[PDB]
Amino acid sequence: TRHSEIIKLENSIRELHDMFMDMAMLVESQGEMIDRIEYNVEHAVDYVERAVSDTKKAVKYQS
């Protein structure tokens, strides 16, 4: 019985190891991705605000 139980335990441990390696790598990649998106959206909002401000100033200058 010793071999059965002990090998079962070791198999379980190794499986957990593998799962965690995989999804930790996944999380790291996700982190890089989110880093990019943040700056992209910030630049978008800034530029839209600036350009619409040009619009208001110009249209009020003409009117």
Partner: peptide
């Protein structure tokens, strides 16, 4: 969960 989260982030970009 993480896989669906990955797909969603990719699409939002």
């Amino acid at each position: 969960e993480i896989d669906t989260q990955n797909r969603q982030i990719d699409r939002i970009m």
